[PDB]
Amino acid sequence: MGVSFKDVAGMHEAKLEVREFVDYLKSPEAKVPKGALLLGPPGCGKTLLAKAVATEAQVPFLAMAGAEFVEVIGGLGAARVRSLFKEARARAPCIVYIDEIEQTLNQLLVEMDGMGTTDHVIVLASTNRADILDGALMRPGRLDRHVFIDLPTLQERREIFEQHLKSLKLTQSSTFYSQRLAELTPGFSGADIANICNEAALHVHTLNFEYAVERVLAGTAKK
Ligand SMILES: Nc1ncnc2c1ncn2[C@@H]1O[C@H](COP(=O)(O)OP(=O)(O)O)[C@@H](O)[C@H]1O
Secondary structure (H helix, E strand, O other), X not given: XXXXXXXOOOOHHHHHHHHHHHHHHHOOOOOOOOEEEEEOOOOOOHHHHHHHHHHHHOOOEEEEEOOOOOOOOOOHHHHHHHHHHHHHHHOOOEEEEEEOOOHHHHHHHHHHHOOOOOOOEEEEEEEOOHHHHHOHHHOOOOOOEEXXXXXXXXXXXXXXXXXXXXXXXXXXXXXXXXXXXXXXXXXXXXXXXXXXXXXXXXXXXXXXXHHHHHHHHHHHHOO
């Protein structure tokens, strides 16, 4: 079994917001959801959440990187977009995930505009770039909504530390330490937090706190 909501720490408002897509994918049959933009800084769980939504609905997850688009080879991106959406229709219900953002873009707009009631695909698109909100993916009949996912708050950081201390079998006193690790890590992303824990795992079922603390102060300069 894959990434689920259990593996996604914090992000409580965003979980409430992708619920409608979980519900739709679980039984197509209100307005028909097409999908959503996940917006925010890197390493903050956009991809993890999109994977979790597929797992929760129990459907396939089909991904395309925004960097299979940028027109370097003529026609190639359009052709990959078409294959993607044809596989998605055949494997439906399912999630199509476009990670991290115009023949290739126009083809995507065509696939989306061409999505009717019968298709049962949800498109989740992620980006670090806010001005994507102003463009063609957010026009009527395309991506329905966006969800802003920011750097984790103190409490969210507590939860992310706890999740990763437990994934790495360092559960003993993980909750004792999580509070201070959170206080020490303003402006850290979930990825930064995962890297601290793993670096400390790479140095029995309890965190080496004094080392974790060292890596937090190192990473505070440059992560
Ligand atoms: N909310 C979170 N809960 C648990 N781990 C997280 C969270 N956010 C980030 N991470 C960790 O950071 C990794 C990279 O994040 P990713 O999903 O690539 O984020 P993004 O798509 O926003 O740039 C995740 O696979 C996970 O290990």
